[PDB]
């Protein structure tokens, strides 16, 4: 289990790496092809929010739904621009 205190002694890029290694396998179980992209999108948010999502499966699942909708929106935006 990854805690605020384990993150606190690491430099910020290492903190994002440690959160990433815990989130990636959960996100990969949901969306194997998008797991790298969705993990990257979630790592941009506040570390406190990321620790909450590792403790609350319902919060993580909703945030992954937000990431999937955001990717769909971006694909639609690009299709609108090309048409």
């Amino acid at each position: 289990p990854l805690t605020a205190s384990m993150l606190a002694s690491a430099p910020p890029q290492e903190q994002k790496q440690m959160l990433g290694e815990r989130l990636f396998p959960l996100i990969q179980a949901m969306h194997p092809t998008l797991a790298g992209k969705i993990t990257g999108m979630l790592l941009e948010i506040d570390n406190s929010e990321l620790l909450h999502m590792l403790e609350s499966p319902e919060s993580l699942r909703s945030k992954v739904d937000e990431a999937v909708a955001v990717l769909q929106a971006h694909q639609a935006k690009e299709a609108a621009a090309a048409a």
């Binding site: 990433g20 290694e21 989130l23 990636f24 396998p25 790298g36 992209k37 993990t39 990257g40 999108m41 979630l42 790592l43 941009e44 948010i45 945030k63 937000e66 990431a67 955001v70 990717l71 929106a73 971006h74």
Partner: peptide, 12 residues
């Protein structure tokens, strides 16, 4: 606002 669709991929 919403998540960033241009975020860099995480590679584990």
């Amino acid at each position: 606002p919403l998540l960033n669709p241009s975020a860099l991929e995480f590679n584990p």
